[PDB]
């Protein structure tokens, strides 16, 4: 008999709501929990694991294991570009399919650093030096090694240590960016050049390959849960 | 919350954090300060929305079917399985084993079919939804004796009211549901590969309690599955190609990713 | 669930073709078992024509004239997963698509076999 | 004054020695152990041979050619015909065990190549028919290594597993396979890869015949290459040793 | 028996919740459960690797 | 919860637990450890759902009848008895005497009948359900003076609202209801065998308060019986053959169980 | 006059629910409980009693 | 006068219930009433029989 | 509350409060007592309704669109932007940057269109409103697979119920929303001037879940925006001329104010 | 099961009301507040600032 | 956890409010937040100007 | 367990990494530092950008042929057209700075050669 | 958003008129890209007549006879903001109003260009 007054939003169904409902089966005993390894409590932990990135995604290479490999060789020249791609993990084709890119497609905003690990896959006798570099937005993608040096760069020397890590620092005006392509929140440009020519001895291949691994740092977050475009369905299975 | 950036100064030393080995399978975990000069920053960002409970706890339409108040088809039967809809399914397939509580919400709408019937008077339509456990008897016809629902949970809903909602506790003979089963049900390995006695919940039956009107009426029922108190184990790579059959992970070979004009290209 | 539902069988003339339609039932399945063997002719004439039917624990062998007293269930249990038929006299006409339907509410399973006679 | 890249593992009456290794990946941080009295289900006393069952079992070698797409193995199935381990399961209904996978491959400084060693639990594989499921023989090859296909498998009416290397038969990106416990062998830095895997399953114990808990896949992202006058034939040997195995349900042998 | 908890608020307040069913599976989702342990996925190696020290 | 398995070792002794005598009518109660070597196991399973309150406390449809807003049949009368529906009845017959509280829920649906009437305007139909105690006056006609319900509990329900529900306290001259009565009501034993003054609750009368529309309308009322605070005494064997008459346990002789091809056969 | 908001599942009838309903007859005195032997409190107790099993269930 | 009780939960939380009717037969079912006493059905014998000792 | 007037007496002195300089840009802040004799007054008036929370926290209709249950147009899509309605927009443009929470209320009404269709029977119409985040997939057709709303928040409303209402938290990559942006999105300044990645919320999609009736029906949906917990920075002059385009502050030159017959005139 | 009685004004939409509504997006982290100059907390403060007044508003 | 606050009344009484959502952005408007600081807009000059003293 | 022949120098936003180096020669034992108030002369406050001016600037590469006589550079002049450093001096009358010279050259075990890297102040030619 | 949507282009006869319809897409835009070039004649005959259409990543050059093989997209990317066309042979008839429509759900952008030939 308590007087009550309903408010706008009664008898409505919001998919994302948190209410209590009656149990279809009362007093039901569920199976006791068992210890299973690799328990996940947050999506970010998955996104912090290195994922192989296919930089050479061109032509029919995406249908072969050649998309992931990156070609390098001995050339009578210096300052040439090994590769180049923009900082768009959510939108760029290169990162759209990585463990990081796959997870970044269920969220709208993303803010944090990105780690790029490059592993030389040449012979023990093969030696070389590259210039990994990241260039800020508002400047045209560097076209020569002189221009690229101006921005954040790391001289990498081939050595007993197989891989060198390039850590892209978070340099943005706003606190967050957009996973979808957006001109206002431009990320930046990542390029690699030859600091020194690859040098090999006789009876040794002068053509090698490199592998790229992209993971997130300890200051990476995402927001606004949204659906992933990738998965499509016209009828039920 | 997240880690705060630490201020650093130019350093010349034998220490080489950037140089490492990826063969060890160990993530480098190198902060920005190791390779460049940074300024102390007090980050206030929090990883709240990236949690599995926040990621998987949303209502997603898994299956919609229709029935009539007359004609051959008078009732609709669907077995509980989340592989019917690609969206919710892909999110669930992210891990190998998931244990969670289930919340069911049903949206029912009735549409009048074209007919030559005249003087049609419609009475508020009442719909009955009955849940049948595995091994329970299934109704042969709309006017069958099974609809008594003595020991079978059932819900009666009248049009113009908020959608019916019930909460189901985790049901699995095994400790946790298995998204992917590698093997055969038969000890002789002569059966459908990947079939498991696990993940079997029940069957849902929906019918019109009363005809309501002389003229024909068709109603479509949509089932929504919202996971609750979810737990995840063994993370795996997300689906790359479109789902063909719910029963088997059968797929069509798909390009690793989209192509670009050439390497060194900043656009798609 | 029927093992290898889509498949193709090749046999020579007069060699007796055995068509395997072995199924497996889920716990939910609790309805009456109904087997229906329907054949689609390679002639391109009316398709989905039934030849042999098993319902109410009884067998009917007269739904298609060409196959008169030639289609018999290989197994006598029939309730068991094995629900297969064998044509004794293979003929040139035999070439066509054979569909096996196992219906136990809830859930219907179908198997399609392409038959070619050399 | 020990060397970081130098190791030796001793199980039963078998010892492996590597003088050029990267490290050891212990699964998800869990070390193989026996079943506790709280998480057990089968009331009968478990039988643990320990010395006979847990020991290194060397499988047949494979050749790493310049066009080799990749190879895969079913850990429970692979050791089903080798030693007491194989015999033990033949006479037992239930079985719970952990494994240590030591993939071995060596080459000269001049030789250049790269391989990926990864353990994938519950690796359900697709089929080319898109309506049927892969046959037991195609999926499981005891005393052999099933290989991957570069070009896509033809679609028809049959039971052939889609061996596509890029989807890897699971319809997922090959590059995203690093999420599972893994290690890389590069002929410029590594000469072997060692991985320790704890038993992982939804149930406490399961049948070891019709069910396979884990799957070992060796895939080369960058191909094997070398100049003329060098060694053309380069083999790869896989040694797998069960850890903390225990069985329940004694019965007449068979499957 | 009312449980008072802190609402999700920005940086740089409280809510009361009661359970009307004894089923417990009839409760709301545990949205405020943020725990991080990536150590197992990122580094499942046997020997701890210091960043200052060279890998091999 | 349930008993935890106890670890045992090989034992050679005079003690013989397995050997016993079934003539004493005493259950052997031999654990697995007595006849074989077991390992200590900490069972966490609980016998919660097997309790009588959990088994019998569910709503089960016992009887549905219909009435019209015009024509001869204008009201429907049913005497309260749970033997009308075989399901709820079989569960109740598991014991000899059961004492419990009763909860009644009614689902009412109206269907428009075919007619040549034109310009049909329907007004929200209101249904009145009246409960009559044993010995109370029963209405002769729909427009009778009895429907005043001065001392008879009655409920008025308007369509488009949640179904009407009322709670009834245990009513029985005797200490508990008797499922099976062996004997005759008459001291001379010349009457229907098994008839008892016990288990008599009342009669339910349902009618339309207003005609509502010029066109004919037929409404069906379903009665649901949910036992509460149930108590059971003297367990008995479950029914083996199909129920023929509610009044008497009369049955048709039925095969003890289904047959198989032969002994030593592992299948049906 | 308290502001209230209904949620999905209002005015619905779930057979297996546990709610409170008004009493059709108020202030009713029920018959006092009497001691009856073989009281049952759980179905399992019944299932723990030996039952004769027809192993030779063949033919007639 | 609110009664706080423990919800049914798995192994290896609380709910508040109030009575708005004085009828008491108008209350909810006693679902949480698990008591076991099979001794009467299983062994209604006069002399206790020890398993170690032979029956006769 | 407000300041209380202070009693004053005739004063002859060198102090000159009224004389001052407006060039300094400093408000004189001279009370009435400085230039004339006043009496002490205890003011009880309070500046409660003039607060920004009281000024901006009211529901204002921002956009209304319609859809049909048949024909070409079956669904309606609108991108979230408050510049659609001049009223709410002018109030918001009072400051440069505003940070606030948002509350959305939708009013949906269905009107039957003229048609030759006969025997029309209508079933309670159910409307689904889906919110899509920036970069999320947009449904191509009414019966598209996107309406599954797995990760997209959506609300289902049935006619005859209170309007659906949801609360949205402040969403902006930047610290606060920017009412006026001076510049170009492109670093090369070759794009629409004033375009900003800020103030982008999402898109709203509204459709009929079921056809409901054979005859055509058209429904109009009105979106209401109520700011909550609002904050304001840098006040600016109010709009003097009528709004032409939502995208740009483009205006038509307007007379500073209305004219009068001459100076010294007390009327308009 | 608590007895309730609705009063005049139920299921009505008053533009100027102060009620609680469910959040469309749960557990959402908003951007931290930044110090911006000239913050306004009351309309009167704006109205206390001198404004040039066009007294000679006649003709063109 | 109920918050008791004073109702808006004339010059010359109390209300209780509870939060049923943990979202916090799901709360009602802060109507009773009256704060005045016009000093910045009216006088943003560097040197304080006394009314008694002449401006220049 | 660090390696004697392994090093990394971090200046500004640029990092160099060498996995085969001999050591580091710090001039005449003096480390680059700012001007003290006792040895200064210009009374005006000095301007120190620090992050922009002090950072690694990579010059164009040269080819080491079998007959290559040698190469030379003027440190102040070389960086006069590169980055803020070049711009800073263009707008400033006086300038005082120190340098770190990292010459890089790599070859295979089979390759054999030798080079001399030396900094000569006031090298009047 | 199209840069300078309303504008007027003046060129002499036979000088090749280039019409600029460069656009910019908002984050919400996620639908299929559809370009539609419709011309309104100065003749005052039926207006809104399409000349060239770009949909489904394909180009159609036959919707208006007078301009036969004379309208080609200047840029080959087309997905890029630049979606411009150029008429090679300017003629006296060319005088009219040209409308450029860029449709990417949600949101439609339109540009109108007045063409005068001296």
Swiss-Prot record, chain A:
Part of the intact protein present: 333 to 569 of 2185
**Function of the protein:** Forms an icosahedral capsid of pseudo T=3 symmetry with capsid proteins VP2 and VP3. The capsid is 300 Angstroms in diameter, composed of 60 copies of each capsid protein and enclosing the viral positive strand RNA genome.
Q: Subcellular localization, per the record?
A: Virion; Host cytoplasm
Superkingdom of this entry's organism? Viruses
**Name this protein carries in UniProt:** Capsid protein VP3
Query: Which organism is the protein's source?
Result: Coxsackievirus B3 (strain Nancy)
- Subunit info? Interacts with capsid protein VP0 and capsid protein VP1 to form heterotrimeric protomers. Five protomers subsequently associate to form pentamers which serve as building blocks for the capsid. Interacts with capsid protein VP4 in the mature capsid. Interacts with protein 2C; this interaction may be important for virion morphogenesis.
Swiss-Prot record, chains B, F, I:
Question: Taxonomic lineage of this organism?
Answer: Viruses, Riboviria, Orthornavirae, Pisuviricota, Pisoniviricetes
Job description of the protein = Forms an icosahedral capsid of pseudo T=3 symmetry with capsid proteins VP2 and VP3. The capsid is 300 Angstroms in diameter, composed of 60 copies of each capsid protein and enclosing the viral positive strand RNA genome. Capsid protein VP1 mainly forms the vertices of the capsid. Capsid protein VP1 interacts with host CD55 and CXADR to provide virion attachment to target host cells. This attachment induces virion internalization. Tyrosine kinases are probably involved in the entry process. After binding to its receptor, the capsid undergoes conformational changes.
Location within or outside the cell:
Virion; Host cytoplasm
Q: What is the recorded name of this protein?
A: Capsid protein VP1
How does the record describe its quaternary structure? Interacts with capsid protein VP0, and capsid protein VP3 to form heterotrimeric protomers. Five protomers subsequently associate to form pentamers which serve as building blocks for the capsid. Interacts with capsid protein VP2, capsid protein VP3 and capsid protein VP4 following cleavage of capsid protein VP0. Interacts with host CD55. Interacts with host CXADR.
From Swiss-Prot, chains C, M:
Instruction: Using the UniProt annotation, give the residues that carry a glycan (glycosylation sites).
Output: 86
Disulfide pairings: 21-100
Where does tissue-level expression of this protein occur?
Expressed in pancreas, brain, heart, small intestine, testis, prostate and at a lower level in liver and lung. Isoform 5 is ubiquitously expressed. Isoform 3 is expressed in heart, lung and pancreas. In skeletal muscle, isoform 1 is found at the neuromuscular junction and isoform 2 is found in blood vessels. In cardiac muscle, isoform 1 and isoform 2 are found at intercalated disks. In heart expressed in subendothelial layers of the vessel wall but not in the luminal endothelial surface. Expression is elevated in hearts with dilated cardiomyopathy.
Please provide the record's keywords in A-Z order: Cell adhesion, Cell junction, Cell membrane, Disulfide bond, Glycoprotein, Host cell receptor for virus entry, Host-virus interaction, Immunoglobulin domain, Lipoprotein, Membrane, Palmitate, Phosphoprotein, Receptor, Repeat, Secreted, Signal, Tight junction, Transmembrane, Transmembrane helix
Q: Does the keyword Disulfide bond apply?
A: yes
**What are the GO MF terms of this UniProt record?**
beta-catenin binding; cell adhesion molecule binding; cell adhesive protein binding involved in AV node cell-bundle of His cell communication; connexin binding; identical protein binding; integrin binding; PDZ domain binding; signaling receptor binding
Q: Does the record bear Kinase in its keywords?
A: no
PTM text? N-glycosylated.
**What positions does the domain Ig-like C2-type occupy?**
1-114
Please tell me one Gene Ontology term that the record gives under cellular component.
apicolateral plasma membrane
| GO biological process, alphabetically ordered | actin cytoskeleton organization; AV node cell to bundle of His cell communication; AV node cell-bundle of His cell adhesion involved in cell communication; cardiac muscle cell development; cell-cell junction organization; defense response to virus; epithelial structure maintenance; gamma-delta T cell activation
- What does its UniProt record remark on the domains? The Ig-like C2-type 1 domain mediates homodimerization and interaction with JAML.
What protein name applies here? Coxsackievirus and adenovirus receptor
Gene from which the chain derives: CXADR
Q: Which residues of the full protein are shown?
A: 21 to 138 of 365
């Amino acid at each position: 008999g308590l007087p009550t007054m309903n408010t706008p939003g009664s008898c409505q169904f919001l998919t994302s709501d948190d209410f209590q409902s009656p149990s279809a089966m009362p007093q039901y005993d569920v199976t006791p929990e068992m210890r299973i390894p690799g328990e996940v409590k947050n999506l970010m932990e998955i996104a912090e694991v290195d994922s192989v990135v296919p930089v050479q995604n061109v032509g029919e290479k995406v249908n072969s294991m050649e998309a992931y490999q990156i070609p390098v060789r001995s050339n009578e020249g210096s300052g040439t570009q090994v590769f180049g791609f923009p900082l768009q993990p959510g939108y760029s084709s290169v990162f759209s399919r990585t463990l990081l890119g796959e997870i970044l497609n269920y969220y709208t905003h993303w803010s944090g650093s990105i780690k790029l690990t490059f592993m030389f896959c040449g012979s023990a006798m093969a030696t070389g030096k590259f210039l990994l570099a990241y260039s800020p937005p508002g400047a045209g993608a560097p076209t020569k090694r002189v221009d690229a040096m101006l921005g954040t760069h790391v001289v990498w020397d081939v050595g007993l240590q197989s891989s060198c890590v390039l850590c892209i620092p978070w340099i943005s005006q706003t606190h967050y960016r957009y996973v979808t392509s957006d001109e206002y929140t431009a990320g930046g440009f990542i390029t690699c050049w030859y600091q020194t020519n690859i040098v090999v001895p006789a009876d040794a291949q002068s053509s090698c390959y490199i592998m790229c691994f992209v993971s997130a740092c300890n200051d990476f977050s995402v927001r606004l849960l949204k659906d992933t475009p990738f998965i499509s369905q016209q009828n039920f299975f | 919350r997240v880690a705060d950036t630490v201020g650093t100064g130019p350093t010349n030393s034998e220490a080489i954090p950037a140089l490492t080995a990826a063969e060890t399978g160990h993530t480098s975990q190198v902060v920005p300060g190791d390779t460049m000069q940074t300024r102390h920053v007090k980050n206030y960002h929090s990883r709240s929305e990236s949690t599995i409970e926040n990621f998987l706890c949303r209502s997603a339409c898994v299956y919609f079917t229709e029935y009539e108040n007359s004609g051959a088809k008078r009732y609709a039967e669907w077995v509980l399985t989340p592989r019917q809809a690609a969206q919710l399914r892909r999110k669930l397939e992210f891990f190998t084993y998931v244990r969670f509580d289930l919340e069911l919400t049903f949206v029912i709408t009735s549409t009048q079919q074209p007919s030559t019937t005249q003087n049609q008077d419609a009475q508020i339509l009442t719909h009955q939804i009955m849940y049948v456990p595995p091994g329970g008897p299934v109704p042969d016809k709309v006017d069958s004796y099974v609809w008594q629902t003595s020991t079978n949970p059932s819900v009666f809903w009248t049009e113009g009211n908020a959608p019916p909602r019930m909460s189901i506790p985790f049901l699995s003979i095994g400790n946790a549901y298995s998204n992917f089963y590698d093997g055969w049900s038969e000890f002789s390995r002569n059966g459908v590969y990947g079939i498991n006695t696990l993940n079997n919940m029940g069957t849902l039956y929906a019918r019109h309690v009363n005809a309501g009107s002389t003229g024909p009426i068709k109603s479509t029922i949509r089932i929504y599955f919202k996971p609750k108190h979810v737990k995840a184990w063994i993370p795996r790579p997300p689906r790359l190609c479109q789902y063909e059959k719910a029963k088997n992970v059968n797929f069509q070979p798909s390009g690793v990713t989209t192509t670009r004009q050439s390497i060194t290209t900043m656009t798609n | 669930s029927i093992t290898t539902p889509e498949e193709m069988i090749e046999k020579a003339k007069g060699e007796t073709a055995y068509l395997p339609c072995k199924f497996t039932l889920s716990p939910e399945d609790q309805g009456p078992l109904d087997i229906e063997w329907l054949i689609s002719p390679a002639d391109n004439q009316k398709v989905d024509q039934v030849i042999i039917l098993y319902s109410g624990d009884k067998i009917y062998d007269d739904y298609y004239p060409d196959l008169k007293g030639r289609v018999h269930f290989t197994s006598n249990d029939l309730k068991s997963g094995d629900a297969s038929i064998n044509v004794t006299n293979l003929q040139l006409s035999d070439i066509g698509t054979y569909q096996c339907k196992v219906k136990k509410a809830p859930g219907v399973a179908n198997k399609k076999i392409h038959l070619v006679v050399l | 004054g020990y060397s970081d890249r130098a190791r030796s593992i001793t199980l039963g009456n078998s010892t492996i020695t590597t003088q050029e290794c990267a490290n050891v990946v212990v699964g998800y941080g869990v070390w193989p152990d026996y079943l506790k009295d709280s998480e057990a289900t089968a009331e009968d006393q478990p039988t643990q041979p320990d010395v006979a069952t847990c020991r290194f079992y060397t499988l047949d070698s494979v050749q790493w050619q310049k066009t080799s797409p990749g190879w895969w193995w079913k850990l429970p199935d692979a050791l089903s015909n080798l030693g007491l381990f194989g015999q033990n399961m033949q006479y037992h209904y239930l079985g719970r065990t952990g494994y240590t996978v030591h993939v071995q491959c060596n080459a000269s400084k001049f030789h250049q190549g790269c391989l990926l060693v990864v353990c994938v639990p519950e690796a359900e594989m697709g089929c080319a028919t898109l309506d049927n499921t892969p046959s037991s023989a195609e999926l499981l090859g005891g005393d052999s290594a099933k290989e991957f296909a570069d070009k896509p498998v033809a679609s028809g009416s049959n039971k052939l597993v889609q061996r596509v290397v890029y989807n890897a038969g699971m319809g997922v990106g090959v590059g995203n396979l690093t999420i599972f416990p893994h290690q890389w062998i590069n002929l410029r830095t590594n000469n072997s890869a060692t991985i320790v895997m704890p038993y992982t399953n939804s149930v406490p114990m399961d049948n070891m015949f019709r069910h396979n808990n884990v799957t070992l896949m060796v895939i080369p992202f960058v191909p094997l290459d070398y100049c003329p006058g060098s060694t053309t034939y380069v083999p790869i040997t896989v040694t797998i040793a069960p850890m903390c195995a225990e069985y329940n349900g004694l019965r007449l042998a068979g499957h | 028996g009312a449980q008072v908890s802190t609402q999700k608020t920005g940086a740089h307040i409280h809510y009361t919740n009661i359970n009307y069913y004894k089923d417990a599976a009839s409760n709301s989702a545990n949205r405020q459960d943020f725990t991080q342990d990536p150590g197992k996925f990122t580094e499942p190696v046997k020997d701890i690797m210091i960043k200052s020290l060279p890998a091999l």
